[PDB]
Symmetry: none
Subunit: 110 residues, 4 copies
Amino acid sequence: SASKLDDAIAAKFGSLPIQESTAIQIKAPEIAENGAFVPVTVATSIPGATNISIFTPANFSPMVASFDVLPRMKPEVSLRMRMAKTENLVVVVQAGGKLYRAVREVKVTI
Amino acid sequence: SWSEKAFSASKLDDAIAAKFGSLPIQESTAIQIKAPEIAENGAFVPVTVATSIPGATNISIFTPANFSPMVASFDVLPRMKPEVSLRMRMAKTENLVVVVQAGGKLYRAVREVKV
Amino acid sequence: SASKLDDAIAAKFGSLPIQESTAIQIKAPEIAENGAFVPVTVATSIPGATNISIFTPANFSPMVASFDVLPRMKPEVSLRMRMAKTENLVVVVQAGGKLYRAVREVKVTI
Amino acid sequence: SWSEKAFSASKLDDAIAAKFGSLPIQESTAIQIKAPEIAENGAFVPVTVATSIPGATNISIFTPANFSPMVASFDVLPRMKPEVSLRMRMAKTENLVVVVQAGGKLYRAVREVKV
Ligand SMILES: [Cl-]
Ligand SMILES: [Cl-]
């Protein structure tokens, strides 16, 4: 669960310190239909950000996307994600030698 | 200018080779690049890139003229209809080159910004 | 590289001991064309095997497949894999509280 | 026998619910199951399963009658044309049920083995 997320994060980023951040914005519907494609957008204001990655640690492929960027480009990513079940969207930004994390739950109906 | 084009064209070839390997590339209308037609001298230019190439797993963005040509690279699981936004400062007029990797093949589109 | 593989393996299996094993068979062509789909088959004779998983640690999704099985069913998996560049196929079997690993390189041309 | 069928049918429903959630399921000819028509009493039966349902990411195999119905579960990245082989001992005649998950939908096929 948490171990898996951390393992996934580590493979992307190595062993860098992680801390929660509100300087990462995640937009997704609060609740979603089983099987529906759902719009998800992620962004960050962290000046030195050189990567923003999206994890869905409950899924077979825990990393959904990875956006490498030069610093100061305020990257945003938008995609459509199929919602199987109530899950957490976990977003991580690297800026320098620090990792920043934000988490958002999407509830799924049946 | 011609020689400056020749220079940045060679730099771009190397970078695409450095990123994807020495793979053949084709031009595509299935890559969407939005940016201002014109922009302010030395300011931030909003850029948006998407693609409708089926099993697209990478979108890489190149700015040939600049010291490091590859400005961004987006890896994704296929069929998530990705759109990637970024802002980039631009000291002068230049082409934005997008290469998308899908299947075992590279797809390219280019858009100019005047400045 | 190695850290990534181990991180990927850990997310699947947890922190179990891993050891190389020749009781895992991997069939793939020695050399492959850039971009080609290539037949790959994996199997194991390890009696207590309850999982066989296939990793491609160089790729964006390091885990390609995972076959959960009851013990004594001698699982085999066969699939078609797109070969981008010279890479290692890494296969791991869980049997009891032990992890078993076998590695095979597929060279790619250009 | 009817009641024994009713029993194992209920067990199967629960297991598919336990594995995939309470999702609707349809029957499919796009699932290929190979096994002997007949087999020896209490011996190993070779089984092969594949599917051609496009974005198939899981193949799960159920043996309803037995104490634990779900016998195997195959997670895979899509479009790798997976075929999964296993041998299973069978004490008596029984149905093999395969459920494939693709997109946000479940697909089912069944094959009988006499023994
Ligand atoms: Cl929605
Ligand atoms: Cl081959």
